[PDB]
From TrEMBL, chain A:
Highest taxon, organism lineage: Viruses
Protein name per UniProt: Major tail protein
Organism: Staphylococcus phage 80alpha
Shown chain mapped onto the complete sequence: 4 to 150 of 193
UniProtKB/TrEMBL annotation, chain B:
Domain BppU N-terminal per the UniProt entry, residue ranges: 7-155
Source organism, top-level taxon: Viruses
Name recorded for this polypeptide: BppU N-terminal domain-containing protein
UniProtKB/TrEMBL annotation, chain F:
Residue ranges occupied by any BppU N-terminal domain in the UniProt entry: 4-123
Upper taxonomic lineage: Viruses, Duplodnaviria, Heunggongvirae, Uroviricota, Caudoviricetes
Name of the protein in its database record: Tail fiber protein
Source species: Staphylococcus phage 80alpha
Length: 147, 189, 121, 164, 181, 123
């Protein structure tokens, strides 16, 4: 029942505490959690190994003139700086004193890939893959500029 | 205790276009004296201290169906509790409940001496209808409890001044009685 | 019992002529029938007695008989509403009958409505 | 100026000849404050603060509501009340008047050379001011209550003078 | 540094009222005289004489008289008992339209009323708009708080007169507690 | 109460004419009806006292009466309005009424507008 465009997605570098921003012109966004469980056989039975889970998210968006954020991303993938991101679902506020902040998932990791693309007579689109680097925390977060 | 003192809303005293917010607070019609709004004020990011001595705070309240022939609106003081932490509470009145539906609110402070005031959020609020009803308070009520209590307290202060000026004649009798009782207590032990 | 018809009378400077009202009493409705009207000039109702106002009802029959300054009651406690009870005289005349609701302050007359209604056995 | 106003805004007024189109500032006052609306301007040349004193350039700020007209609107040019002549900190207290004129209001700065006709002007901005349940909600009860308090004072004054 | 408050509503005072203190005010909404009534609007006026200490205070408060509404004039006949105070009588008029707008126009002015009738109808007259519920308290709040502080001063004088003997009570109790030892 | 119409016209080289403003007064509105005129010019509004002039409306009643130099009571500082309280004798007639307004000081007479209205005869 949630229209995808309700999902809002923010990033920022850990070092820049003050800095804040949002990703714009998403077309397709996809999160993923991949459990590595390969059971190794046993004579008396079988055991299901509990392996790490490399969660990652891939999003594609457009690239316009009044923004350079995507350039910061294609910088980070190379410089391999840390970032942290916020997958906040709007229209879902707090419960007691957190109404201004809506539910979200917070996770800190690196951008594992940047790939943009051009097409004669068309707007260029940049895709990015971000590795979450561990457990993703839950709670609520506040948007900037009321949008 | 039994009362709806669980809610709490934060009022950001900052000039950054703090928009209206649906606080998601839905009291009911047949609720008297137990509907309470816990306000917590914040200056920039941390709580703003307050006091009934320096400043005086009030809140305005207005239903959404407010008309001249039918509506609801009031403006009344607060009940500061844990002021240093910027916390306070408002006991919802009894006549206002009879009017159901959406509601808008507001909390404004006035700094004594200068009368320079401050307005925080203009937040939203809800009130629902129950089955204990049938009496219709369609008559729109608009009373400025602030100035009303002001005049009532001025009258009461005049009356208390009168009673004290009357008692001024009894103070000598009090002195004499106290001295006599002291002398008696001495002579006893 | 009573058969009352509520109506709104507005002082609109762009002429005022309230046409055929759905109301249609009947001859033998001697005293039960009654008209009830509320005046509303610009901001809602108007309290007549508030400032020396006096209403007047002058109604013309479809045929012959013509009456002037008919009686009425004023529930002033509420507002400047009028309740005209036909006293077994007007209703006896069948056919439609038009009215003229005059309103006079001292030395200041106004005509604010022209309404009618049909009547049959 | 006191520790009661909003004063939660830092405007970066940079004297840059390159370009400074407009600031759609995100700021509000709710039309009912009317006693404390503070604007904390900064000042910079390229990326560093300026050093302006009283003997040096004098300050000015022009405010102008959105729909200004000789019959309707608002427009005034007043001072800035410099705070720090080192980091370029200018706290301006908005008047008691404009906050009655709801809606939007554009603004601009202005710097006059102390001792010469040379001047400087900074980037525009627009600090909207919204409506409030405080500045509306009725057009009788206020008069009724002022009348009631007037009657009460006029009455109790008799007994007060009597007992005094 | 001009102003143009967007209510286009004003209450002017006729300078041609120099005789018999017949205060004849006029209303102007959108550069137009407003047709009023007894129900559609409301009015009020307050007058206080020059700075009498407390003794001779021409402190009067009364409504208006609609002399000609369709033309937009409001008359107020000055009470004979009031104009006896030849001191400069400050005046505060208040008009209110109740047209779904919270406009309450206040007019502060004064003159040099003489014991016979209004004289020297001068003084820099100003106007304000009560467009917020805090200055309804501050409109008359000046003299209101003045009388409140006067009552508080009398109260503290009474409290000092009472403490003069409460101190005697303290001396009595302490001397007795010392004597019993 | 009182019936009033708040109209405003403007002097124009092309000449003006208003098409029977929708105010159908009634003959029985003896001393309540009226008209409120506000003149306009190139700048937005006119002030008579500034350059002292006098307006005057002349109206041609229904085939049997013509009035001139009507009362046309001036207004206050509002600078341009006139509340022409319509008297009794006038509305005693009915039908298609049409009036025309002029401004004069001395030797400068200018016809500002020529509008009309109607009065209903309600016996």
């Amino acid at each position: 029942m949630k229209n995808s465009n309700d999902r809002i997605i923010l990033f920022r570098k850990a070092g820049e505490k003050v800095d804040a921003t949002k990703m714009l012109f998403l077309t397709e966004y996809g999160l993923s959690h991949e459990a590595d469980t390969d059971t190794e056989d046993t004579m008396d039975g079988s055991y299901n190994t509990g392996g790490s889970v490399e969660s990652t998210m891939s999003g594609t968006a457009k690239m316009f003139y009044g923004d350079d954020f995507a350039d910061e991303i294609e910088d980070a993938v190379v410089d391999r700086v840390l970032y942290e991101a916020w997958e906040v679902e709007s229209r879902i506020p707090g419960k007691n004193g957190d109404s201004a902040k809506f539910k979200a998932k917070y996770f800190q990791g690196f951008h594992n890939k940047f790939e943009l693309k051009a097409e004669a007579n068309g707007i260029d689109e940049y895709e990015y893959e971000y590795g979450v680097n561990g457990r993703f925390q839950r709670g609520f977060a506040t948007l900037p500029e009321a949008v | 205790n039994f009362s709806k003192d669980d809610n709490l809303i934060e009022l950001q005293t900052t000039s950054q276009y703090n928009p209206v917010i649906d606080t998601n607070i839905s009291f009911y019609e047949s609720d008297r004296g137990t509907g309470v709004l816990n306000f917590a004020v914040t200056k920039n990011n941390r709580p703003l201290s307050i006091s009934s001595e320096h400043v005086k705070t009030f809140i305005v309240l207005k239903t959404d169906d407010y008309n001249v022939d039918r509506g609801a609106y009031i403006s009344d003081e607060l009940t500061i509790v844990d002021a240093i932490n910027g916390r306070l509470q408002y006991v919802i009145p009894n006549e206002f409940l009879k009017h159901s539906g959406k509601v808008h609110a507001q909390a404004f402070f006035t700094q004594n001496g200068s009368d320079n005031v401050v307005v925080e959020r203009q937040f939203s609020f809800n009130i629902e209808n129950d089955l204990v009803s049938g009496f219709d308070g369609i008559t729109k009520l608009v009373y400025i409890k602030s100035i009303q209590d002001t005049i009532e307290a001025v009258g009461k202060d005049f009356n208390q001044l009168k009673q004290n000026m009357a008692d001024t004649q009894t103070l000598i009798a009090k002195v004499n009685d106290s001295a006599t009782k002291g002398i008696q207590q001495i002579e006893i032990k | 019992m009573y058969k009352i018809k509520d109506v709104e009378t507005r002082i609109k400077n762009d002429g005022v002529d309230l046409g055929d009202i759905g109301c249609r009493f009947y001859t033998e409705d001697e005293n039960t029938a009654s008209i009830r009207i509320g005046i509303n000039d610009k901001q809602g109702r108007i309290d007549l007695k508030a400032h020396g106002l006096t209403p007047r009802l002058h109604l013309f029959m479809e045929d012959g008989s013509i009456f002037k300054n008919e009686p009425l009651i004023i529930d002033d406690v509420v507002k400047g509403f009028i309740t005209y009870k036909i006293p077994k005289k007007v209703i006896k005349h069948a056919g439609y009958v038009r009215c003229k609701l005059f309103l006079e302050k001292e030395e200041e007359k106004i005509h604010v409505a022209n309404f009618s209604f049909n009547i049959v056995d | 100026v006191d520790n009661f106003s909003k004063d939660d805004n830092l405007i970066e007024l940079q004297t840059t000849s390159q370009y400074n189109p407009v600031i759609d500032t995100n700021i509000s006052f709710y039309e009912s404050d009317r006693g404390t609306g503070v604007l904390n301007f900064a000042v910079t040349k390229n990326n560093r603060p300026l050093s302006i004193s009283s003997e040096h350039v004098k300050t000015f700020i022009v405010l102008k509501t959105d729909d200004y007209n000789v019959d309707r609107g608002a427009y005034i040019s007043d001072e800035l009340t410099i705070v720090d002549a080192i980091n370029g900190r200018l706290q301006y207290v908005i008047p008691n008047e404009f906050l009655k004129h709801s809606g939007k209001v554009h603004a601009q700065a202005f710097f006059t050379q102390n001792g010469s006709d040379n001047v400087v002007v900074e980037r525009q901005f627009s600090f909207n001011i919204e409506n409030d349940l405080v500045s509306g909600f009725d057009g009788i009860t206020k008069l009724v209550y002022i009348k009631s308090i007037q009657d009460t004072i006029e009455a109790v004054g008799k007994d007060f003078n009597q007992l005094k």
